[PDB]
Amino acid sequence: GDWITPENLTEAIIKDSGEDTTGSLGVEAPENQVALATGDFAVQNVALQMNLNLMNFMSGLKIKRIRNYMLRCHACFKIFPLPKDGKPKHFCASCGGQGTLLRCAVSVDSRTGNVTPHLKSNFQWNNRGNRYSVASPLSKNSQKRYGKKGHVHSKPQENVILREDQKEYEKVIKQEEWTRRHNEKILNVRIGKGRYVNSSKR
């Protein structure tokens, strides 16, 4: 690995944000009247295709082409910017596919202004856990399990999350934010069933 030290600490903290502290990371490449030095790929992405000038502040040269990562849904083939927590969202915002977003290598050119994905030509698809038995809400079995006490507010006859706009989903995303802030100042969840749903748990 690499040693963290009390001198290096601030740089390491920035690296864990995902920002390029080194400069020239993945760089592949009216006169010079303005230039921008920045280490954030999200800003760089906008700058390049608007035909702005980017400055490699580690070296003093303008950048024409760069390679980085973005998300791509393999169902509908649409491309999305990588969120700043650095992992996929659960649902595709276009087609509503569940878990279909994969991180994909991408290149950008000032010259063309276009965006190009790079695909692994020998990809093997994994299909473990795509299909499984799930309860139906209107079965006679379900109506017996529901019980005689009406809606139980503790252990709330749990219903699985399967849609983006299901009201159950709205709670978990905001509650996740709340628990984050509470725990961090005091110190100062998963959806679907995963691949192995079909293997019995003792």
Partner 1 sequence: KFESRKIMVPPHRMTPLRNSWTKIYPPLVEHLKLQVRMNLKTKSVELRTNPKFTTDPGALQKGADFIKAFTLGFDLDDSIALLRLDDLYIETFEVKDVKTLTGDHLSRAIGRIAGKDGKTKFAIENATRTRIVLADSKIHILGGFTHIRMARESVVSLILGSPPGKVYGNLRTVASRLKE
Partner 2 sequence: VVDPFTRKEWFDIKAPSTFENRNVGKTLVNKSTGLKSASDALKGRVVEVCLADLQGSEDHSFRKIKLRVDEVQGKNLLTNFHGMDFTTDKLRSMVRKWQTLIEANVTVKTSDDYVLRIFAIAFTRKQANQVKRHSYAQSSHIRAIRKVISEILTKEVQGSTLAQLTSKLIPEVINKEIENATKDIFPLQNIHVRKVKLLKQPKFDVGALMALHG
Nearer to partner 2, 1 or 156 (CB): 1
Sheet with 115-118: list strands edge to edge.
79-80, 65-73, 101-109, 115-118
- Considering only 25, 29, 55, 75, the residue that binds Zn ion (CB under 5 A) is 75
**Closest C-alpha among 161, 157, 163 to residue 142:** 157
Q: Is 186 strand, coil or helix?
A: helix
- Considering only 46, 61, 76, 135, the residue that binds Zn ion (CB under 5 A) is 76
**Closest C-alpha among 81, 63, 61 to residue 71:** 81
**Closest C-alpha among 108, 63, 121 to residue 81:** 108
Q: Measure the CA–CA gap between 11 and 18, rounded to whole angstroms.
A: 11
104 annotated ligand-binding residue: no
Nearer to partner 2, 33 or 199 (CB): 199
Residue 158 in the binding site for partner 1 (CB under 8 A): no
Q: How far is the CB of 81 from Zn ion (least distance, A)?
A: 15
H/E element, 106: strand 101-109
- Considering only 23, 26, 97, 99, the residue that binds Zn ion (CB under 5 A) is 97
Residue 188 in the binding site for RNA (CB under 7 A): no
Q: How far is the CB of 195 from partner 2 (least distance, A)?
A: 8
Q: Which residues are annotated as a binding site for Zn(2+)?
A: 73, 76, 92, 95
Query: Which residues form the interface with Zn ion (CB under 5 A)?
Result: 73, 75-76, 92, 94-95, 97
